[PDB]
């Protein structure tokens, strides 16, 4: 709910289920797994999970930051209300699909209908790599290369138990191939504009918009879908661990993506996606910070 | 205890660099092998995986039976040694504003080259895009002094440092048996960022 | 049922006297010529008495009877309320106004050259029907009127009646073919039968003949659709270091097309319908005409849930089919502008609403239930269940069935069993079969690919565009000439008709005053575009050394030798703009690649050129790179035929100038400041006085032709010359 953490990457790799592919933003169960894998190195994991199972804190997945915070595209909005000139409105829906991020200065101009030519930050490149003199040695890493002014900003409760972890993620990296150069950034904690923190609710039964990959608790998951307009994003992967000598997958969680609009806000949960017969839990953060649309 | 000391250096290219990228298109007159560049600023980069792999393939020549390369570079197997303690980084051409003061139009030269048949004696030309000489690139290399490895930090400093003399004495790039290497590190200082660790016992072992 | 059959055939074999009477010029009315001819071949009074009385104008009240349904469906399936002109072109009533073009009435074949319209077919063609009509009278001479051959007669019409008009004594309706007019009549008539048999009505003359405006404005049809989502990601899930080169891509984009075919088929026999009611099927999209009643809508919802359970069983939210249906009266008929497309879009809104709010409570709680200690995964699609070790890689159930289907892809016949090969539905799996193995295998429904003959299996006729001159790795090595001249590269082209949805929905709305915007025009337009991209691309890829990895809808993705890729696309567009009278621009991207390069690294760089040619203006070819981006009218005329032949003509009728001169011209064309105009003027004048006096006017007429476009100051003449010289160097490479 509190201050938002601008993070200037200039180089990243963000998943998308493979290594040939890369997102633009990094899906806040990744930043939670980064904080847990950083607090495990410090021996700070117990107090961090104690902080992490409270109503006090939040997390929120990344969004682009060009001189101001950006928001997801509200999925399902704008609803129709101008059904003419097929030649250009059929051409625009190929372009208005690839927008997916809006500034706060016009996010309520979007719910009323505006065209919003997609700005160009962070070309998602690709490079072929190798391992010399070996058998099959041509993997291809999709670089996310930010445009020298764009940052990512998780939104959280500013606590020093977490701010030490966030200051150490400056130097440990945050992304796909952290050891080979990707994902490492510089943090800058800034305050929130008054037209954003006014809308960051968590319990307002109203037309609302999720701002992380969330997963409702089953009493609220029934009619989270009766009005929700969402994606599912399939948060899978292998569970990282220093106690395997093997490679086991996580439990393949499906979560409502960011920008999923709702009515009647819900309550998320820390979904233990631990493998069967596995020593320590694998946590997979899904509890949402929301956003009021018409309030 | 926990710290993260970084090894800042200016790298220096005493011959060119050809770290290749993706092979786009021949385009008869254009460059056959273009150097990898930074796609926002169109500027020559060293990707950190090239530094990391070349340093690993030199130190692995020095240390054969290993156990010390695995903890400093990582290992997919052997649960102790995943994400092994070193986090390299791309190298971003710090003196863009200085090389044009030395008088130059681009930061990458195009070296023409050929291949001569042994019997037919007919040439086969090439244009290889190298980075120019004495481009100086940024460099940092996070070493994480975590809780467990406290007794063995200094025997992981005589290996990080010994892996830099090798890059000064091997080529660090592509096609480096024909020149195109000779990369010398300078101002190799080890500062500490996010930690409580004293590096006044290391910066004399570096210089 | 038991009498939905004869209503179907009598609303399909009616106006067949418009073939015999139109051929022999008989004075008897067409509602009697074929009606009395029908008794020669078989004895079925139920269909015959519909054909004797389908017009309901010779006998108003003589025949409960089912020709009332046939007459109202024949009015609705036309463009109006329905003598020596042939069938007009579809693109006469399309868009801007151009010449009036007319088809020559022919049959269809896989080896037949296309049937391009022309303005010189204004008189009526009568002698071309004797080959057509007797072609009707053979296979219809021994035919059975049931579900066994409910689908084989539809190809028998669409092979032969595809370029045959309907009721030439008219003013407007000409380009609706008889194989489409009869098809849409049989499509509506069964939906009227369902809408009338559900609502308990029995006598028809008081609701379908004298109460014309009662049913004419009663919301009594559904335009269904569906949208198999996630097709592109599933197909281009291939990456670098993949076991299958393009067989895992051919056999994967073919498999989803059989899935799109089978959703459309098996949806129509959960209802009581058949292939006439389907307006179109394509790349996962398939539009229908159904009945606006509750027993159909609940069948739609239950079948949608069934197929989504199937897709969740073995594709795990990568594929999602989303139905959607718009209720409409007889309002696809010239409140004229804002009635037709406004209800065709009502189904797309329901699709977009269901594509966005995918699942429900139980089917997502069952998803993330946990409970799996997986060590390995399918390294193609990252799935977990049913891992095998097919060629010592850990792959899944679907991605081993796709290698089995890639071994079976070359057959003509594809049958649906219950337990063999790739699953395509609930208790329904696909297997590729040889012809004489149909007695060995045991199936339920058989598809035959690229065939207009009726055959022996009595199958459903699909038409997937495919061609293979050789295997992929030879396409570089066959890039040479017989002399060895030619660079050893292979090209990949990806095409797309620009703005096809805009040319389909709006489409016909410019001519007239919204009077040509019917359902029949869009149905014939779908048949035209489907006919082209599923039949004629194999004609265009006949002699050439290529492979069509996909063709259909409006995409052509094709790998091959680069001479025979550039020639392929020049030929394809110069036939497509004759096919569409110059409407419907298409815009390709060709990319050159060396031998032995991976196919995703190849296809993605081709698709980037395709989208870099979408945004030139719209209509462009993007040769090999981001900069060589030419409008096709500025490419095929200027570069490929004018300049390239002038360059080849100069550089083969001499011996002094060689490739060094061409290379020095390519450099002066590529760098090009104002200084290189002077340096080029010096270079060519030096070489003018260095050539011998035999060939000096030959060189002067080349340098006054190269310096002329070099210094042209329009920028659309210098960029063309660089691509022309690149192609001439690529032609003569050793
Ligand atoms: N079987 C196939 N093989 C190859 N290409 C195909 C196939 N089916 C469809 N396509 C292509 O895919 C295009 C449509 O892509 P796509 O984006 O998946 O549309 P869609 O069905 O709406 N899926 P989505 O975009 O998620 O809604 C078509 O225009 C074709 O060019
Ligand atoms: N014969 C046809 N009749 C109707 N729709 C069709 C037909 N063939 C293909 N389509 C569909 O029309 C749509 C056009 O897709 P697409 O080509 O991506 O859009 P577009 O209109 O061409 N705009 P653009 O991609 O810029 O050219 C796809 O969903 C096809 O499946
Ligand atoms: Mg298109
Ligand atoms: Mg298309
Ligand atoms: Zn698979």
Short mmCIF file of N, CA and C in Angstrom, two decimals, chain C residues 39-93:
data_model
loop_
_atom_site.label_atom_id
_atom_site.label_comp_id
_atom_site.label_asym_id
_atom_site.label_seq_id
_atom_site.Cartn_x
_atom_site.Cartn_y
_atom_site.Cartn_z
N UNK C 39 -36.80 -38.73 -61.72
CA UNK C 39 -37.32 -40.08 -61.65
C UNK C 39 -36.52 -41.08 -62.48
N UNK C 40 -35.57 -40.62 -63.29
CA UNK C 40 -34.79 -41.54 -64.11
C UNK C 40 -33.79 -42.33 -63.28
N UNK C 41 -33.29 -41.73 -62.19
CA UNK C 41 -32.11 -42.25 -61.51
C UNK C 41 -32.48 -43.03 -60.26
N UNK C 42 -33.56 -42.63 -59.59
CA UNK C 42 -33.99 -43.29 -58.36
C UNK C 42 -35.46 -43.00 -58.15
N UNK C 43 -36.09 -43.82 -57.32
CA UNK C 43 -37.51 -43.70 -57.01
C UNK C 43 -37.63 -43.21 -55.57
N UNK C 44 -37.90 -41.91 -55.42
CA UNK C 44 -38.17 -41.33 -54.10
C UNK C 44 -39.14 -40.18 -54.32
N UNK C 45 -40.42 -40.43 -54.05
CA UNK C 45 -41.46 -39.45 -54.31
C UNK C 45 -41.38 -38.25 -53.39
N UNK C 46 -40.75 -38.40 -52.22
CA UNK C 46 -40.73 -37.34 -51.22
C UNK C 46 -39.85 -36.18 -51.66
N UNK C 47 -38.66 -36.48 -52.18
CA UNK C 47 -37.79 -35.43 -52.72
C UNK C 47 -38.37 -34.89 -54.01
N UNK C 48 -38.95 -35.78 -54.83
CA UNK C 48 -39.44 -35.42 -56.16
C UNK C 48 -40.59 -34.43 -56.08
N UNK C 49 -41.56 -34.69 -55.20
CA UNK C 49 -42.69 -33.78 -55.03
C UNK C 49 -42.28 -32.45 -54.42
N UNK C 50 -41.12 -32.38 -53.78
CA UNK C 50 -40.57 -31.08 -53.43
C UNK C 50 -39.96 -30.40 -54.65
N UNK C 51 -39.29 -31.17 -55.51
CA UNK C 51 -38.70 -30.58 -56.71
C UNK C 51 -39.78 -30.20 -57.72
N UNK C 52 -40.87 -30.97 -57.80
CA UNK C 52 -42.00 -30.60 -58.64
C UNK C 52 -42.69 -29.32 -58.19
N UNK C 53 -42.58 -28.95 -56.91
CA UNK C 53 -43.36 -27.83 -56.40
C UNK C 53 -42.53 -26.84 -55.59
N UNK C 54 -41.21 -26.76 -55.84
CA UNK C 54 -40.37 -25.90 -55.00
C UNK C 54 -40.59 -24.43 -55.28
N UNK C 55 -40.98 -24.08 -56.51
CA UNK C 55 -41.17 -22.67 -56.83
C UNK C 55 -42.45 -22.13 -56.22
N UNK C 56 -43.47 -22.99 -56.08
CA UNK C 56 -44.79 -22.65 -55.54
C UNK C 56 -45.42 -21.48 -56.29
N UNK C 57 -45.24 -21.47 -57.60
CA UNK C 57 -45.77 -20.42 -58.46
C UNK C 57 -46.50 -21.05 -59.63
N UNK C 58 -46.12 -22.28 -59.97
CA UNK C 58 -46.88 -23.05 -60.95
C UNK C 58 -48.15 -23.61 -60.32
N UNK C 59 -48.05 -24.09 -59.09
CA UNK C 59 -49.21 -24.55 -58.32
C UNK C 59 -49.15 -23.89 -56.95
N UNK C 60 -50.05 -22.94 -56.72
CA UNK C 60 -50.05 -22.20 -55.46
C UNK C 60 -50.51 -23.07 -54.30
N UNK C 61 -51.74 -23.58 -54.37
CA UNK C 61 -52.28 -24.46 -53.34
C UNK C 61 -52.74 -25.76 -54.00
N UNK C 62 -51.79 -26.66 -54.22
CA UNK C 62 -52.07 -28.02 -54.67
C UNK C 62 -51.48 -29.05 -53.73
N UNK C 63 -50.22 -28.88 -53.34
CA UNK C 63 -49.51 -29.84 -52.50
C UNK C 63 -50.00 -29.81 -51.06
N UNK C 64 -50.27 -30.60 -45.59
CA UNK C 64 -48.90 -30.22 -45.28
C UNK C 64 -47.97 -30.66 -46.40
N UNK C 65 -46.96 -29.83 -46.67
CA UNK C 65 -45.95 -30.16 -47.66
C UNK C 65 -44.70 -29.34 -47.34
N UNK C 66 -43.54 -29.87 -47.74
CA UNK C 66 -42.26 -29.31 -47.34
C UNK C 66 -41.64 -28.39 -48.38
N UNK C 67 -42.34 -28.07 -49.46
CA UNK C 67 -41.80 -27.12 -50.41
C UNK C 67 -42.04 -25.68 -50.00
N UNK C 68 -42.85 -25.45 -48.96
CA UNK C 68 -42.97 -24.11 -48.40
C UNK C 68 -41.68 -23.69 -47.72
N UNK C 69 -41.08 -24.62 -46.96
CA UNK C 69 -39.77 -24.41 -46.37
C UNK C 69 -38.73 -24.18 -47.45
N UNK C 70 -38.81 -24.95 -48.53
CA UNK C 70 -37.86 -24.83 -49.63
C UNK C 70 -37.98 -23.48 -50.32
N UNK C 71 -39.21 -22.99 -50.51
CA UNK C 71 -39.39 -21.71 -51.18
C UNK C 71 -38.96 -20.55 -50.29
N UNK C 72 -39.27 -20.60 -48.99
CA UNK C 72 -38.85 -19.50 -48.13
C UNK C 72 -37.33 -19.52 -47.93
N UNK C 73 -36.70 -20.69 -47.90
CA UNK C 73 -35.25 -20.75 -47.81
C UNK C 73 -34.59 -20.35 -49.12
N UNK C 74 -35.28 -20.53 -50.25
CA UNK C 74 -34.74 -20.09 -51.53
C UNK C 74 -34.86 -18.58 -51.68
N UNK C 75 -35.90 -17.98 -51.08
CA UNK C 75 -35.95 -16.52 -51.02
C UNK C 75 -34.88 -15.96 -50.10
N UNK C 76 -34.69 -16.58 -48.93
CA UNK C 76 -33.77 -16.04 -47.94
C UNK C 76 -32.32 -16.22 -48.37
N UNK C 77 -31.99 -17.37 -48.95
CA UNK C 77 -30.62 -17.67 -49.35
C UNK C 77 -30.15 -16.83 -50.53
N UNK C 78 -31.05 -16.17 -51.25
CA UNK C 78 -30.68 -15.23 -52.29
C UNK C 78 -30.37 -13.87 -51.67
N UNK C 79 -30.11 -12.90 -52.53
CA UNK C 79 -29.91 -11.53 -52.11
C UNK C 79 -31.13 -10.65 -52.25
N UNK C 80 -32.26 -11.21 -52.69
CA UNK C 80 -33.47 -10.44 -52.92
C UNK C 80 -34.66 -11.36 -52.69
N UNK C 81 -35.83 -10.94 -53.16
CA UNK C 81 -37.05 -11.74 -53.10
C UNK C 81 -37.24 -12.38 -54.47
N UNK C 82 -36.61 -13.54 -54.65
CA UNK C 82 -36.64 -14.24 -55.93
C UNK C 82 -37.81 -15.21 -56.00
N UNK C 83 -31.60 -12.78 -69.92
CA UNK C 83 -31.67 -14.15 -69.44
C UNK C 83 -30.51 -14.96 -69.99
N UNK C 84 -29.51 -14.27 -70.53
CA UNK C 84 -28.42 -14.90 -71.26
C UNK C 84 -27.08 -14.33 -70.81
N UNK C 85 -26.87 -14.27 -69.50
CA UNK C 85 -25.60 -13.83 -68.94
C UNK C 85 -25.00 -14.96 -68.11
N UNK C 86 -23.67 -15.08 -68.17
CA UNK C 86 -22.96 -16.04 -67.36
C UNK C 86 -22.88 -15.55 -65.92
N UNK C 87 -22.24 -16.33 -65.06
CA UNK C 87 -22.08 -15.92 -63.67
C UNK C 87 -21.09 -14.78 -63.56
N UNK C 88 -21.51 -13.70 -62.90
CA UNK C 88 -20.65 -12.56 -62.68
C UNK C 88 -19.53 -12.91 -61.70
N UNK C 89 -18.49 -12.09 -61.72
CA UNK C 89 -17.43 -12.24 -60.74
C UNK C 89 -17.93 -11.75 -59.39
N UNK C 90 -17.34 -12.31 -58.33
CA UNK C 90 -17.73 -11.93 -56.97
C UNK C 90 -17.35 -10.49 -56.71
N UNK C 91 -16.27 -10.03 -57.32
CA UNK C 91 -15.70 -8.72 -57.08
C UNK C 91 -16.27 -7.65 -58.00
N UNK C 92 -17.36 -7.95 -58.71
CA UNK C 92 -18.07 -6.90 -59.44
C UNK C 92 -18.84 -5.99 -58.49
N UNK C 93 -19.39 -6.55 -57.43
CA UNK C 93 -20.16 -5.78 -56.46
C UNK C 93 -19.31 -5.43 -55.23
#
